[PDB]
Amino acid sequence: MNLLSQVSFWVGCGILAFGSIVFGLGAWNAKRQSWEEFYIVHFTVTTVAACAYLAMAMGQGEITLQNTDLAAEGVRHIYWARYCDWIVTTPLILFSICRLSKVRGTMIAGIIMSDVLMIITGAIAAFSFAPERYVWYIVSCMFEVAIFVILLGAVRTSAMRQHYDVKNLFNLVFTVFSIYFWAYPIVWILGQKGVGLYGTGVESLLIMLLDITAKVFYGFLLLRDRETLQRMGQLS
Amino acid sequence: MNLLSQVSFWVGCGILAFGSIVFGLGAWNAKRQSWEEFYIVHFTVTTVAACAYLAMAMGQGEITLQNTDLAAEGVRHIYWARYCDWIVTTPLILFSICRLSKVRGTMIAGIIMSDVLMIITGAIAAFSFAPERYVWYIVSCMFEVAIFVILLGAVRTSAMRQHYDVKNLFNLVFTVFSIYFWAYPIVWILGQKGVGLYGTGVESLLIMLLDITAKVFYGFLLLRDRETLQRMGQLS
Amino acid sequence: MNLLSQVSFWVGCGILAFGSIVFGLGAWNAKRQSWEEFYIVHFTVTTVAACAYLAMAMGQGEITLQNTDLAAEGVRHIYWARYCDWIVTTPLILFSICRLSKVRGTMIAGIIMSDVLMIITGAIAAFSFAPERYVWYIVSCMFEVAIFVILLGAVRTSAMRQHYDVKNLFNLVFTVFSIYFWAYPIVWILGQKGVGLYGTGVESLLIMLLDITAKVFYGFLLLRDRETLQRMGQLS
Ligand SMILES: *C/C=C(C)/C=C/C=C(C)/C=C/C1=C(C)CCCC1(C)C
Ligand SMILES: *C/C=C(C)/C=C/C=C(C)/C=C/C1=C(C)CCCC1(C)C
Ligand SMILES: *C/C=C(C)/C=C/C=C(C)/C=C/C1=C(C)CCCC1(C)C
Ligand SMILES: CCCCCCCCCCCCCCCC
Ligand SMILES: CCCCCCCCCCCCCCCC
Ligand SMILES: CCCCCCCCCCCCCCCC
Ligand SMILES: CCCCCCCCCCCCCC
Ligand SMILES: CCCCCCCCCCCCCC
Ligand SMILES: CCCCCCCCCCCCCC
Ligand SMILES: CCCCCCCCCCCCCC
Ligand SMILES: CCCCCCCCCCCCCC
Ligand SMILES: CCCCCCCCCCCCCC
Ligand SMILES: CCCCCCCC
Ligand SMILES: CCCCCCCC
Ligand SMILES: CCCCCCCC
Ligand SMILES: CCCCCCCC
Ligand SMILES: CCCCCCCC
Ligand SMILES: CCCCCCCC
Ligand SMILES: CCCCCCCC
Ligand SMILES: CCCCCCCC
Ligand SMILES: CCCCCCCC
Ligand SMILES: CCCCCC
Ligand SMILES: CCCCCC
Ligand SMILES: CCCCCC
Ligand SMILES: CCCCCC
Ligand SMILES: CCCCCC
Ligand SMILES: CCCCCC
Ligand SMILES: CCCCCC
Ligand SMILES: CCCCCC
Ligand SMILES: CCCCCC
Ligand SMILES: [Cl-]
Ligand SMILES: [Cl-]
Ligand SMILES: [Cl-]
């Protein structure tokens, strides 16, 4: 295994496990049901990812596949543990944003469905040879568009409607999510699974940076935002 | 791949994707929550199947297995993508019928459980050699019986009790479902997985006709029925 | 296959199928929704396990793997059908105990999450070589600790708070569960997957005895307890 990959996995595991300690002890100490739910959701997020990173750090959850002539020179290292992690953790992150926005349940169900299909077709893409890999990559990207038509549409609207004097708070919530979410397909397609701009070591580093941003630091941002809304009296 | 199979997959993909356009744009435009839920459920149904048909059309999601002497002459083409599709789409079709009938949640949970086990044991059957394949086929058929004791019993009863002057409407809902649902195990057992009456091409054509009936045209029937009930004032 | 294994699988299948008859006919005959839910949950428990035992009895659902020098002499027989069964049946048993205790939903979600991760890391452990197998075994055991901090904490507390004059009833509910639940990791680690104290035949017998205890006889205990609470008037 690439050394940069090896190190990125151990570093992601430890950072994610730090988040699990914060969220887990928060759930243990929370008295209000809405804080128990928040912490339990975000504890699952970091803990599932921390398990996936532990497996990759130990040399598991990976399969190496040959590339064709319609692909980058060499091979692709498919860390299928990533998609097992993502199919569970990304619907939970979206669920958390939706609960903070207080949006109706039909939008929650629609955004979770779009997200699960985005991940599933992403994993099909990763295992596919070209040109099928590229067809599935585009299908996965269109499911990502459907996530954002729901998020920046009905979810954001319900967030602005049911809260007062917190436009900048929710703007940061949706803007920061929007940025790291769109970075994943870019990081993916610039590696060996698309254009051979960089190899599996750099890709592993970039994904790890995205993962700790989305699961630990973004979680802390939603935590702080919940505190702000509670001190204002518009949390529940 | 068989040409009739190849064509049936492309034809099913396009027809299913037509349904996804109808249901998806209906969800986008729906103002009432109960219409949002209806369209989102049926959009998932056609879209998941359309993805499975795209994979099979492109030559993926299939494994060919040898038959024993207790089986039809030749081999069996197992399109395992079918069961990944079915384990998600058939509980959603049943959920839609149950919501239209306004039945209590315990019956919804019971019918979904029976259905998921029907599909799982069906996939075990398909991967099994004889005689195990035949044992699992019978077990799967008994789970299908359990679906209908719930459907034609408590679900239908609650549909007739909580609605007025729409006996013929609900009769068609349960009768049309009953017919295509029982056709699947027949189509399955007359192909190479049971009696060798026809090969994988004809079976692929028959399944595709069942799939577009159940997911597109039956969906349009439930759509029209929802409109009828709404114009009568007994939708919610 | 080991004869003791062969017999234990057929015996477990028949005993589990006996439980499915009791719980299934109870669901069919139940008039109150809360009894319908109880029977449907416990019918799923025995029926899913009975399917898994039928597969193992017929020689399916098993893979044999080589052991290293950091492991017991010989091989490990991994019945992966067990974990497919467990990932579905153990969250349902916990759900049933939580509903009987009338605990808030956040605790139900937390205990189900801990349980699913316990089973998943257990299956990773089983497929892993040493030393990874031992790392995952410990991780799985820590998820089991997290189940019991929730169960003996918030769930038990809510059981004592919302019921009168039934301390001994609930004490038996949590004590009997506690005992068989902790026996599983012990049985697992004393077989070929840990210390080579006994082989796959004895392990298969011990698991089968645990499985019928947890799914049939413990189910009958919760049934009798529900009857007691109903005759007292504190069931719902
Ligand atoms: C904690 C993990 C997170 C936030 C992961 C997010 C993942 C995505 C937004 C995935 C995107 C993909 C595409 C739209 C297509 C190409 C492949 C994927 C699966 C990386
Ligand atoms: C859109 C897909 C639909 C409506 C599929 C329905 C599938 C079934 C009713 C499956 C039935 C099966 C049996 C009862 C046993 C033999 C194999 C199966 C899985 C085809
Ligand atoms: C009906 C099945 C039941 C009650 C199964 C319960 C299973 C467990 C408590 C599993 C425990 C495990 C560990 C904590 C680690 C080692 C391996 C497992 C998965 C056996
Ligand atoms: C000792 C090396 C064996 C390699 C195979 C062991 C199986 C590893 C499975 C890892 C799956 C990770 C998914 C994480 C999501 C919870
Ligand atoms: C959403 C349900 C559809 C399930 C279809 C799974 C297809 C997986 C295909 C994996 C690629 C293997 C063949 C590679 C051909 C380029
Ligand atoms: C519902 C959980 C049970 C999971 C059992 C999976 C069994 C799959 C067996 C596949 C057939 C392979 C062996 C073929 C022997 C005829
Ligand atoms: C990794 C830090 C420990 C995490 C503990 C997770 C369990 C959460 C407890 C939920 C409240 C239980 C109080 C009875
Ligand atoms: C405020 C009420 C929230 C209810 C959430 C229900 C969402 C269920 C999602 C299930 C997965 C998506 C299936 C289409
Ligand atoms: C294939 C046709 C497009 C399907 C779009 C699916 C997204 C559904 C939108 C739900 C309402 C969002 C309004 C903000
Ligand atoms: C009208 C209320 C509907 C509630 C539906 C709950 C059904 C949950 C099904 C989960 C799968 C089945 C598990 C046994
Ligand atoms: C194995 C014994 C039969 C089990 C039947 C399971 C179906 C449960 C029926 C639920 C009530 C349906 C009444 C209309
Ligand atoms: C009394 C209300 C019960 C509601 C139960 C909700 C539990 C949902 C569990 C879903 C799996 C766990 C995900 C973290
Ligand atoms: C080997 C590259 C290190 C990158 C660290 C990035 C810190 C934000
Ligand atoms: C090569 C590992 C880089 C670690 C970056 C840490 C960012 C918080
Ligand atoms: C060993 C290959 C496993 C593939 C799992 C894919 C999960 C999305
Ligand atoms: C090759 C057979 C064509 C079948 C078309 C059926 C139209 C309903
Ligand atoms: C061989 C493909 C037949 C297509 C039938 C279309 C039915 C609507
Ligand atoms: C490559 C074989 C996959 C089998 C998947 C079965 C899903 C029901
Ligand atoms: C071969 C050992 C039989 C064990 C039976 C145990 C009865 C409780
Ligand atoms: C060797 C099979 C033992 C069966 C034990 C039955 C316990 C109820
Ligand atoms: C043939 C190996 C299947 C492994 C399935 C593991 C399910 C937890
Ligand atoms: C956390 C310990 C990992 C040991 C590496 C095999
Ligand atoms: C693997 C090199 C041959 C592929 C041509 C598309
Ligand atoms: C305000 C939501 C979209 C922001 C993305 C830059
Ligand atoms: C490989 C066939 C291309 C499919 C385009 C939808
Ligand atoms: C594959 C032919 C031999 C099988 C006999 C049951
Ligand atoms: C009226 C429901 C059953 C009809 C099947 C022909
Ligand atoms: C192959 C054994 C037959 C099992 C019948 C239940
Ligand atoms: C399989 C025997 C060699 C393993 C040494 C750790
Ligand atoms: C009273 C619950 C814990 C009992 C375990 C022996
Ligand atoms: Cl390629
Ligand atoms: Cl055969
Ligand atoms: Cl080993």
Author numbering:
A (entry chain A), B (entry chain A), C (entry chain A): 1 to 236
What does the paper say about this structure?
Rhodopsin is a photoreceptor membrane protein that binds retinal as the sole chromophore, a simpler light-utilizing system than the chlorophyll-based photosystem, which consists of many proteins and typically multiple chromophores. Here, we used a metagenomic mining approach, which led to the identification of a novel rhodopsin clade unique to cyanobacteria, cyanorhodopsin-II (CyR-II). CyR-IIs function as light-driven outward H+ pumps. The CyR-II clade is further divided into two subclades, YCyR-II and GCyR-II, based on their specific absorption wavelength.
The crystal structure of cell-free-synthesized P7104R was solved at 2.07 Å to clarify the red-shifted absorption mechanism of P7104R. The P7104R monomer was composed of seven transmembrane helices (helices A–G) as well as other rhodopsins. A detailed comparison between the structure of P7104R and N2098R or BR showed that a pentagonal cluster near the retinal of P7104R, which is known to be important for proton transport, consisted of three water molecules adjacent to the Lys215P7104R, Asp85P7104R, and Asp211P7104R (corresponding to Lys216BR, Asp85BR, and Asp212BR). The structure around the proton exit was also similar in arrangement, although Glu (Glu182N2098R and Glu194BR) was replaced by Lys193P7104R. The cyclohexane ring comprising the retinal chromophore of P7104R was more slanted than those of N2098R and BR. A comparison of the amino acids around the retinal showed that the Ile171N2098R was rearranged to a Trp182P7104R containing a larger functional group, and the distorted structure of the retinal was canceled by Trp182P7104R, through Phe181P7104R and Glu144P7104R (orange bold). These results provide support for the hypothesis and indicate that Phe181P7104R and Trp182P7104R play a role in the red-shift of the absorption maximum in YCyR-IIs. Through our structural analysis, the high pKa value in P7104R may also be stabilized via a hydrogen bond between Ser96P7104R and His42P7104R.
